[PDB]
Structures are given as structure tokens and as C-alpha cells.
Amino acid sequence: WKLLSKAQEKFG
């Protein structure tokens, strides 16, 4: 969720 997109956002 937000905890996955927020952290992944800076990875993708």
C-alpha cells in the first residue's frame, strides 16, 4: 500500500 508505493517510489 502507501508504505509500499512510498518506499518503492524512490526505487522505481
From Swiss-Prot:
Q: Give a short account of its post-translational modification.
A: Poly-N-acetyllactosaminic carbohydrate moiety seems to be needed for TLR4 activation.
Task: Report the locations given in the UniProt record.
Answer: Secreted; Cytoplasmic granule
Out of the domains of life, which is the source?
Eukaryota
What is the annotated role of this protein in its UniProt record? Transferrins are iron binding transport proteins which can bind two Fe(3+) ions in association with the binding of an anion, usually bicarbonate. Lactoferricin binds to the bacterial surface and is crucial for the bactericidal functions. Has some antiviral activity against papillomavirus infection. N-terminal region shows strong antifungal activity against C.albicans. Contains two BBXB heparin-binding consensus sequences that appear to form the predominate functional GAG-binding site.
Spell out the family assignment given in the record's similarity comment.
Belongs to the transferrin family.
Quaternary context: Monomer. Found in a complex with LTF, CLU, EPPIN and SEMG1. Found in a complex with MPO and LTF; interacts directly with CP, allows Fe(3+) incorporation into LTF and activation of CP ferroxidase activity.
What is this protein's name?
Answer: Lactotransferrin
